[PDB]
Design a protein around this nucleic acid. Structure first.
Ligand code: MG
Length: 1026
DNA sequence: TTT
């Protein structure tokens, strides 16, 4: 996996659409919508933890997400509540699955614990979680200054409806409001198809979808918070890429109605497969589904009155036409996997396949009555889903009452289909629980119905099969497998609940009501005390307010869908976070250039964008004339502000200082580089690279200080200079950006912290006293002697052999050293796991790589010798190679030893041994003078304001360097001082930003003397003490 | 809940 198949697909068909970015590349947002069931799953059962632990970790998760994304206006976190029957059927399927998969995996314990099905609403678990969560919001917002300008909304298991859909509802409600901002930048947590489709159908302009790369789980690889990156999808581009795909639907010289088109595309996306209906065998993404629905639609389009999905409502005639068209696809799928006048033969065999299918797999006779009710229920289904999205739930009771899908060929007279579902109401937690849980998890229910789950007398015993069969329509994985069970009739079920209900325990009786969502807002006025809750410590005073809002204060009742295209919004202007391909006249074509967006090269086609040859003559003097020294926007459509510092040609090149000659070789090389990037990753094709432009990316606003006189404010550019083809330069666009300081004193208030950049105490803590130069008091502190520790390390660094040397000492082939020292999978792992060549990793002091050659330390060698001594035949195998019990034996022998306990790290990073760490720690132990001075303003770091380019060291950071923290860094408060014990580079795997492509950021495993002991920290938040 |  790594990422959903849908995400993967549309992400490769439109290369510019998605990226893997780090904390700082994520665009600014007003609203973050966080969906919790995923998280709760990650934290509860990835081995043992108690509730306290779990909650603590969930809380953490949230904290780090909010910390990294910094939603400026709203933070809506939404836990799945009691959902409509349509979903509940599937929820139930997944429960039964997990229960049985659970028993099966516990069976390995027979060969030789936290029930997860409690992640559903109504369970004592989820309730306790709800509590702890409100408590958490209250603490965080009440204490943390960063959660105080935000508005926060929680929607718990209390409030009914899928998290993702409660989010949706709040969004539509939002659009409804009068003085609502059409430009609000929405960020939604998640990558699966449903959330893409969802955000895409809100018809919101600045909407991003994102999820972290690695669950926070790989913390056994020591990753700083700031090091974590996100996969993100830009809906704004998705739109433009569809506008590109259906260009053939244009009949005149003018844009198609994108609202109209998006709607229909939402429809296709729903056809590919959704939760609330069985999937059509003939439509899987890997199976080229989207392209097929595209072809079908395009080729059918001139015939429909207009849209199949009009503003969330279906056009049964047009629908009909479409499905009719899909018949081809379906029949072709049949013709393909059949074996696992010709046509006529095909059709007879296919009709026979139908009959036999209805009979065998549908357990129903093929009466035309059957086709009838199948068509009925299917069309009903579709409309139901569209309502779910465009207008909110329109039926809590309704559900597709079959386990399989109709035959497209057998869908005629759709138009005659009557659609009528009724709202009804969401089930009470216990009802839904009994509807969803399998016999296995009876415990999660109150005692009152345990009997109902497990006593074969039970009226509902049918719905609780000890054994349930599973059909897999050519779907490979057990999870894709259909789960053949009954469908609960609400009647009989509530009938079999009547007696028990009264007898429920008091607290059980109380926890069985639906509930509201809560709105937290930081208050200056003290709101009183809060009790503690495992694991949140108690609070003497709250500084926030919690306020109940019910499901119906968010309700929008109208004939049309508010999921319309707000016209107040500005799509002419550029917003920094959000790319558009609009500002450049370009042609386009769908080609087969094998673009590389993820790990490996795409196997299918993509859309190549081709900017039209610009009007500016492609000469040096001409390009310079226009753009030299000017402020432009490069990268496209992922635009950035930048200033042109040089223009170059294979022959010559212009600086502010005049024209000179240029290295042809180096130029042609740069050009190759650019070409490769754009085509292979960006699916972009410029006319030519005859003339390059070299820019500096905008790097923050800078405040200059003018003598004793005044405060100046200017633009700040970058350190590094990157090259961009002159053909992709876009100039003079207007942008929507957006609190200046006033007095010098306003900048430097009394008692605020100041850091020194002047030689006498480069890196000294300080405090401003009087803005007159500036009056300041510096707190001088001693610095530990590290020469000793350095010395220790140098000798250890000496302890290293070469791959060959090591081959000789162990008397083994080079190959066998290769397999032995890496990871070798047997089917289970049996490699000492010291090096990870493909990954580009190395294990601590054991392995290390320099001249593209490997070197192993002594611990490594004694280890490898050990392995050899003990397990010879295995080695013999490694050497001569290109009851299942011995494996487990050595797999464990290996997993046990301590090199596993030692951190693995990326190659090119310098580390240190625990002994040296000991010496250092001892020195700091051993170590345990305010000086007033007048200091020019530009040599003072204001902790969270000053741009890091003013304090970046002219020399790369080194080990044992003495560092102090300026910029705030998650756990570590500013001011904390320490010494470097690690230096770790980091490069983006596949940057879509040409500027980032080979940029390496530096993190430092730092030993702060104070406990707060050790943390990786970006070089940006550091000064070195001179 | 995801794959
Ligand atoms: Mg969901």
């Amino acid at each position: 996996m790594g990422v959903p198949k849908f995400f993967r697909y549309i992400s490769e068909r439109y290369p510019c659409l998605s990226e893997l970015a780090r904390e700082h590349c994520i665009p600014e947002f007003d609203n973050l919508y966080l969906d919790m069931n995923g998280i709760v799953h990650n934290c509860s059962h990835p081995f043992h933890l108690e509730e306290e632990q779990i909650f603590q970790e969930i809380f953490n998760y949230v904290d780090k997400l909010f910390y990294l994304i910094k939603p400026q206006r709203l933070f809506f976190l939404s836990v799945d509540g009691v959902a409509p029957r349509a979903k509940m059927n599937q929820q139930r399927s997944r429960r039964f699955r997990t229960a049985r998969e659970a028993e099966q995996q516990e069976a390995k314990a027979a060969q030789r614990r936290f029930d997860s099905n409690c992640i559903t609403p109504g369970t004592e678990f989820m309730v306790r979680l709800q509590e702890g969560l409100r408590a958490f919001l209250k603490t965080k917002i009440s204490t943390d200054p960063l959660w105080q300008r935000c508005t926060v909304i929680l929607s718990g298991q209390e409030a009914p409806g899928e998290g993702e859909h409660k989010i949706m509802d709040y969004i539509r409600y939002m659009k409804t409001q009068p003085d609502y901002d059409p430009n609000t930048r929405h960020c939604l947590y998640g990558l699966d198809a449903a959330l893409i489709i969802l955000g895409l159908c809100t018809h919101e302009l600045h909407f991003v979808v994102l999820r972290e790369e690695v669950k926070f789980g790989r913390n056994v690889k020591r990753t700083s918070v700031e090091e974590t990156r996100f996969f993100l999808l830009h809906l704004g581009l998705l739109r433009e890429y569809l506008e590109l795909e259906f260009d053939a639907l244009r009949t005149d010289e003018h844009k198609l109605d994108i609202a109209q088109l998006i709607d229909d595309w939402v429809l296709m996306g729903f056809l590919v497969g959704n939760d609330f209906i069985p999937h059509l065998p003939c439509l899987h993404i890997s199976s080229n589904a989207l392209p097929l629905l595209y072809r079908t639609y395009i080729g059918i389009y001139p015939t429909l009155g207009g849209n199949i999905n009009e503003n969330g409502k279906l056009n049964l005639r047009r629908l009909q036409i479409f499905i009719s068209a899909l018949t081809e696809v379906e029949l072709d799928h049949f013709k393909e996997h059949a074996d696992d006048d010709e046509n006529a033969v095909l059709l007879k065999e296919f009709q026979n396949y139908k009959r036999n299918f209805y009979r065998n797999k549908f357990k129903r006779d093929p009466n035309d009555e059957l086709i009838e009710e199948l068509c009925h229920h299917y069309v009903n289904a579709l409309q139901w889903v569209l309502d779910y999205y465009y207008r909110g739930v329109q039926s809590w009771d309704w559900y597709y009452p079959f386990h399989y899908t109709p035959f497209i060929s057998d869908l005629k007279n759709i138009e005659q289909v009557e659609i009528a579902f009724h709202m009804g109401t969401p089930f009470l937690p216990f009802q839904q629980l009994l509807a969803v849980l399998p016999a296995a998890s009876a415990k999660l229910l109150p005692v009152a119905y345990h009997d109902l789950m497990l006593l074969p007398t039970s009226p509902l015993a049918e719905f609780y099969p000890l054994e349930f069969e599973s059909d897999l329509n050519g779907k490979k994985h057990d999870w894709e497998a259909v789960v053949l069970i009954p469908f609960i009739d609400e009647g009989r079920l509530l009938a079999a609940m009547l007696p028990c209900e009264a007898q429920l325990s008091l607290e059980e009786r109380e926890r069985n009501r639906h509930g509201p969502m809560y709105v937290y807002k930081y208050s200056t006025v003290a709101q009183g005390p809060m009790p503690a809750y495992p694991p949140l410590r108690a609070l003497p005073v709250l500084y926030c307010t919690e306020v109940a809002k019910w499901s119906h204060e968010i309700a929008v009742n109208l004939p049309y869908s508010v999921c319309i295209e707000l016209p107040n919004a500005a799509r002419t202007v550029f917003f920094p976070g959000f790319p558009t391909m609009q500002h450049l006249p370009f042609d386009f074509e769908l080609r087969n250039d094998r673009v590389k967006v993820f790990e490996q090269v795409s196997r299918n086609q993509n859309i190549v964008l081709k900017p039209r040859k610009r009007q500016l003559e492609d000469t040096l003097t001409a390009v310079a004339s226009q753009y030299l020294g000017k402020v432009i926007h490069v990268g496209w459509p992922h635009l950035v502000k930048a200033i042109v510092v040089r223009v170059a040609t294979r022959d010559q090149r212009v600086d502010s200082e005049g024209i000179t000659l240029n290295d042809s070789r180096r130029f042609d090389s740069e050009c190759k580089a650019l070409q490769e990037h754009f085509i292979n990753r960006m699916g972009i094709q410029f006319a030519n690279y005859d003339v390059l432009v070299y820019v500096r990316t905008f790097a923050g606003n800078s405040t200059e200080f003018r003598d004793k006189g005044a405060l100046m404010v200017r633009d700040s550019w970058s350190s590094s200079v990157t090259g961009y083809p002159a053909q992709g330069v876009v100039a003079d666009l207007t942008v929507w950006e957006r609190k200046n300081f006033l007095n010098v004193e306003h900048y430097f208030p009394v008692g605020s912290t100041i850091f020194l950049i002047t030689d006498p105490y480069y890196g000294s803590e300080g405090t401003v006293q009087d803005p007159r130069r500036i009056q300041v008091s510096i707190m001088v502190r001693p610095e530990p002697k590290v020469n000793a520790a350095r010395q220790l390390q140098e000798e250890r660094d000496r302890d290293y052999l070469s791959t060959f040397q090591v081959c000789n000492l162990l008397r083994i082939s080079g190959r066998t050293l290769g397999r032995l020292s890496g990871t070798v999978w047997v089917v289970h792992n049996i490699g000492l796991q010291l090096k990870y060549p493909r990954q580009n990793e190395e294990r601590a002091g054991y392995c290390f790589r320099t001249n593209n050659q490997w070197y192993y330390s002594s611990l490594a060698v004694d280890l490898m010798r050990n392995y050899c001594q003990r397990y010879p035949d295995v080695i013999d195998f490694f050497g001569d190679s290109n009851g299942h019990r011995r494996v487990e034996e050595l797999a464990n022998w290996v997993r046990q030893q301590p090199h596993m306990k030692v951190e693995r790290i990326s190659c090119g990073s310098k580390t240190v041994c625990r002994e040296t760490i000991e010496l250092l720690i001892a020195a700091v132990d051993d170590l345990r003078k305010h000086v007033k001075l007048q200091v020019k303003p530009h040599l003072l770091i204001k902790p969270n304001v000053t741009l890091p380019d003013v304090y970046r060291s002219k020399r790369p950071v080194r080990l044992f360097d003495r560092v102090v923290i300026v910029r705030t860094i998650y756990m570590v408060p500013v001011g904390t001082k320490g010494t470097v014990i690690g230096i770790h580079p980091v490069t983006d795997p596949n940057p879509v930003r040409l500027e980032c492509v080979h940029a390496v950021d530096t993190f430092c495993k730092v030993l702060f003397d104070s406990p707060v002991r050790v943390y990786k920290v970006p070089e940006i938040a550091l000064v070195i003490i001179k």
